[PDB]
Amino acid sequence: GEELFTGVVPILVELDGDVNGHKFSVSGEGEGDATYGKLTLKFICTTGKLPVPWPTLVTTFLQCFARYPDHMKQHDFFKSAMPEGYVQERTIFFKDDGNYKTRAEVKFEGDTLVNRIELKGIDFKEDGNILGHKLEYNYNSHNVYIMADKQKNGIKVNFKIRHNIEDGSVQLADHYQQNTPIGDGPVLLPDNHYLSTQSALSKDPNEKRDHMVLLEFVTAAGITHGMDELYKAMAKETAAAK
Amino acid sequence: GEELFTGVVPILVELDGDVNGHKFSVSGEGEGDATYGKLTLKFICTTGKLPVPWPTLVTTFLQCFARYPDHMKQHDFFKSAMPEGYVQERTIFFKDDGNYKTRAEVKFEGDTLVNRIELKGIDFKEDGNILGHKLEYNYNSHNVYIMADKQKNGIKVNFKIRHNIEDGSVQLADHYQQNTPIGDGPVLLPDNHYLSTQSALSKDPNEKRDHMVLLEFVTAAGITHGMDELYKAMAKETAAAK
Amino acid sequence: GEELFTGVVPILVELDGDVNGHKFSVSGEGEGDATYGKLTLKFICTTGKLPVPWPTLVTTFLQCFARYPDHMKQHDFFKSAMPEGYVQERTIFFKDDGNYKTRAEVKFEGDTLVNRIELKGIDFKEDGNILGHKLEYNYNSHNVYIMADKQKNGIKVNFKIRHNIEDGSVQLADHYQQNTPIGDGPVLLPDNHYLSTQSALSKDPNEKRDHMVLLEFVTAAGITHGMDELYKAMAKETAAAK
Amino acid sequence: GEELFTGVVPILVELDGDVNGHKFSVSGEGEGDATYGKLTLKFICTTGKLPVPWPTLVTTFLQCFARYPDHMKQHDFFKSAMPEGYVQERTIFFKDDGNYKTRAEVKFEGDTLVNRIELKGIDFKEDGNILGHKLEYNYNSHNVYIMADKQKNGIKVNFKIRHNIEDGSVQLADHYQQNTPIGDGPVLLPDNHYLSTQSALSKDPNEKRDHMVLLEFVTAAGITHGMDELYKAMAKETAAAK
Amino acid sequence: GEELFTGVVPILVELDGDVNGHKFSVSGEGEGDATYGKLTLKFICTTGKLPVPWPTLVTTFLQCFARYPDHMKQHDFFKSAMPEGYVQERTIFFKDDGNYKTRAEVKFEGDTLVNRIELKGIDFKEDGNILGHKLEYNYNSHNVYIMADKQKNGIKVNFKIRHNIEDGSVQLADHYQQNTPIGDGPVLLPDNHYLSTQSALSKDPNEKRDHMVLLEFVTAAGITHGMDELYKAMAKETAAAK
Amino acid sequence: GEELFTGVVPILVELDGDVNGHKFSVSGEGEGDATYGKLTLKFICTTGKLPVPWPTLVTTFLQCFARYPDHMKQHDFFKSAMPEGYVQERTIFFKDDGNYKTRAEVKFEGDTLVNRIELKGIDFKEDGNILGHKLEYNYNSHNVYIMADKQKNGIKVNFKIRHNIEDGSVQLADHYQQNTPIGDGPVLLPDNHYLSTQSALSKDPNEKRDHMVLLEFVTAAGITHGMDELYKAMAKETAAAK
């Protein structure tokens, strides 16, 4: 489980997509440091130009690298499914636009953590913010709400992504997600909590292929450590010590 | 710089140590509130039992969380080096005993302030106050003397820690310290001043691992606000107003 | 309790306000000497220009620093709630104008006495003495009437502030106040008494930010020492000694 | 070149050996997935019982299936020689024991990647760890050091294999290796780098012949992506975005 | 059976054909290497010019040379009938055109594997793709579906050949096939499986006779090795070994 | 020439021999199929019992029936001398024993290929492997080395026959041979090559006369087809076609 993430883990991401008949593929590589909740990744569209904005694919392109506070370790489903891994499925609704449906298998292949995805996008507007490439090349910080789904020995996940539109408006992308273990062994079914995520997007000035450089920090939160009473008592004692 | 510390900052501390061949590791987590100069932390020895007393590691285990009075803000080197951070190095001489040499990198990893340390301790007495675990589980209040070191675009720091020995005596630990920025940008080189520090140590009754709960308040002082003349003049005026 | 105030205590004041939609923040620092009932403070509007006159915020911006005569020490609720502190709530009615509602938590954070406030002001006249900045930059001396409120293990406080208007008239501000302990321990529930207060306001000629320098003396009074008979008897005896 | 390895490639291995006059043959089959650096193989001794331990033959029994990071693709000699292939020659010195000399031709035969080997072993001790079958049925993880050999339009390779001995000791096997292209076309002459290799050995419970089931992961590393400065700059920018 | 195919086997092919009254003969020679599933052949029309395109005769002109994976050896009917051999009969329907009916005896004549065929073609269009020589001089890769026919102690075989037409279209040739042993001994009756075939056609620049140079690779597939569970278990174990 | 051998040719063999004064005659009949290099023959000793082992006479008792690969047809001297035929002369040295000298005329008599021989054997040991009948009733496979002899418009032939002795040892019979045309027309003078020969000996269970049933396959080899470069180029092209 979590002992597989104590150091720097190499990452490989592979995606095949089809959005309104526009077929494409993406290869990604990087490193994940779960002790810091840190991800450093670079994605390449291997089929030519990407037919959708790079930011629309960020959530599709590694929650097993989230930093879980020590007091929340028993709620880390993602690592508990390793090395066999988990299936991560989503429906992403772009408000007043199309939807993406995704299925990914996240697992170890030796020392490499692999994220293998298939993406299907339908009902997009050819002149909308996605197919029309009207989204800024940036990313907002979000909270990812996790709950146990004991019927599927997994988790149900929900959140709203806000993509900045070039005109100053916002393109909402409502995420519905479920993760189920690939293996038959025990997994950690969590209490309700969330992951706080921050992401930066950039370009490699030496890269001529269509690509995205991504830096992401992911931290679990929302479950009390229950030490408030202890620290309050320690503050009372200091006053008697001065 | 200082704008990164206006609210509550999550903290992560990681230490690898070797004291007279006794190897150990420690993980720490908490929160820092620089507006109040407040630190709430909990440390866990992840390798088993700590081979040294917990109080001997307090100064090694976040001066960027000190409360700097408004009139002293231009002297806060620690925050000025952020987010790139600083290297903090020490030699700690335990009187009539061994020494610790430490090297830490204090910096941001996303929203998390991280303190990554390596500790080397030699020449300790196997039956002394440290290796013999003769130190009380408490901590005294101290002043930490800071001066600029313009040759290294950093600071030189010196102070004496007084560790209470179980027999009522005192184990002195003389600290020599230097901090240098990780980045190449400007930093605040301070005038001579000090930090006043108070610390309380406790145990989590629910924690069965070897650990330390620490509450610490740190305040900068020693530089005049130069308002003595103004307040004296205001006191003269009140007498004429009654 | 009172043993935490025997010397000079550093003070920190933090306020967030909203008056008729005009949002602002203030940071304050100083020292309190409860042996003399003395407060020396400097406040800075950190958001830009203050949308209300500085004198309107004086009572909102430390009654735990009042000088209580030795014979009245058993009536000092404010210090008795320390270090855990107290919640101080007010409604301030500006005659023929708006009102401020305030909630502050006054408590120790290590050696620092902190006053953390939230201020809400509504129904002000955009052209009145407050929003129109028609108040002189000065302050009158007042009496603050205290009574026990045993139902809330606290005190109820009432007084009238007279703010001088630039045209020579007076802007009355009727204060209704309640203080309740943060902790569950015993507190001193007082007999009816009052605090006599005097305040001087000034500017720091070196400060370019919008700010207020404040000097304030606060003394408890209104409860007999009951020594009138003893001194009268001593005066009778002197006549027989000459 | 590398386009011949994008999917799952069937593998065939054929070996004829003679070790101190003990003649034997081995047939092997499997699949190679160069995208994951993964090899799944099963070897059968077709002449009867193998006269040497199965682990001693692991390195002799497909470096064209290594996973080369995108930023290191120009250094993948092995695939660049395909389909014509390469000759792989070795001398393997077993410390305090005999040596193996090997010559293999690795090339495509239609869709099948074939490894055809001849092995000659001399100077072995009849009672040593090899001829005496004193080696554990397991395998350690190693680094394989590669350098260009421009005189032979090939590569020179060196590494040390550590074979665990049943008594807890180690049987060292020093590998000297050279690979030269079979064809006359251009090949990729690499900068110095290494391959990180991990291997698991098992038995097929249904197989009654003398055999070895092998799972192996091979990843190229040791050449910088040069993106450290870019990610550092992206981390600086995030601090200004929060 | 299969022991007759361990090395390189010389091949002789003899055909007599009649297509719509156009009589011709063909002699072929080559080598078969069943260990690699490889065939190298050269065919000569001995009567003059061939009245049909060379690609239309490829399937008529050695399935005993297919590479059968070790785990599928018990399903190799073709070699099991050797040396006595088998009769191979077909009806080939050229869509919107004529049909070929073939009868071949494939058997050993000493060390030589001989394929002796008689071909009868009727109902061809004199201006169609066959008699009109409108087929490209190339060949696609196909799957050949095999099933046991226990009533005839043989196999039934079916597949579709796609011949490229010079105008970019496709000439389909639906193959129906049966193979029966010449001898009375036991043969291997297979479970359903297929052969994957790839073929290249060329000309000998020194040959002035009407001819075809053919290179063909044939591999059996479609039956599980059942080792998926074993390799998955080996991957789990590696994670516990790192 | 070669057009006289395209189908099945009836064969007649006639021998008169004298070995150490032991006179005998043999009549043989069969069929030769030069397309397969196949000979089916039955020999009868017409004078009574043969005074030498049947295997010693196999090479004396039809090289015009060898299968010459298409690329080697210009090197087939034997058929090129037909129908007039050739004289075939030998000296056969039986190691540590006697010698046979033979002269045969091989030619057509209508549709029948006739081999008329005279055999003279001297210096045999009455108790040796030949006169003592110590040779097994079997035959090994051999290579027959052919070279042109332009001085005699013929060929010189040499090879070693290994006859198995009943005790497990070997009786070597070194063959020296020359063939010269009977006619004056052109013949094919070959480049150095060899014939690969395999022979099986049996008895007719219905035959009561002293006899030998012989099945023999003879194939020319040792001259390159020179198509290695063409097939290598075809293999390169397939990789670009998949």
From Swiss-Prot, chains A, B, C, D, E, F:
Changing residue 142 to D: In Cerulean; leads to improved quantum yield, a higher extinction coefficient and is 2.5-fold brighter than ECFP. Changing residue 63 to H: In P4; leads to no detectable fluorescence. In mut2.2; shifts fluorescence lifetime from 3.03 to 1.94 ns. In mut3.3; shifts fluorescence lifetime from 3.03 to 1.88 ns. Transmembrane segments: none annotated. Changing residue 165 to V: In EBFP1.2; shifts the excitation and emission spectra to shorter wavelengths and increases quantum yields compared to BFP. Photocytes. Changing residue 200 to V: In EBFP1.2; shifts the excitation and emission spectra to shorter wavelengths and increases quantum yields compared to BFP. Changing residue 61 to M: In RSGFP4; increases fluorescence and shifts the major exitation peak to 489-490 nm. Changing residue 170 to A: In mut2.1; shifts fluorescence lifetime from 3.03 to 2.50 ns. Changing residue 141 to P: Increases fluorescence at warmer temperatures such as 37 degrees Celsius. Pfam families: GFP. Changing residue 169 to G: In GFPA; leads to enhanced fluorescence at 37 degrees Celsius. In Venus; leads to yellow fluorescence, improved maturation and reduced environmental sensitivity. The keyword Metal-binding does not apply. Changing residue 99 to T: In EBFP1.2; shifts the excitation and emission spectra to shorter wavelengths and increases quantum yields compared to BFP. GO terms for biological process: bioluminescence; generation of precursor metabolites and energy. Green fluorescent protein has been engineered to produce a vast number of variously colored mutants, fusion proteins, and biosensors. Further generation of mutants led to more stable proteins (at 37 degrees Celsius for example) with brighter fluorescence and longer fluorescence lifetimes. Changing residue 27 to R: In mut1.28; shifts fluorescence lifetime from 3.03 to 2.76 ns. In mut2.2; shifts fluorescence lifetime from 3.03 to 1.94 ns. In mut3.3; shifts fluorescence lifetime from 3.03 to 1.88 ns. Contains a chromophore consisting of modified amino acid residues. Maturation of the chromophore requires nothing other than molecular oxygen. Monomer. Belongs to the GFP family. This is Green fluorescent protein.
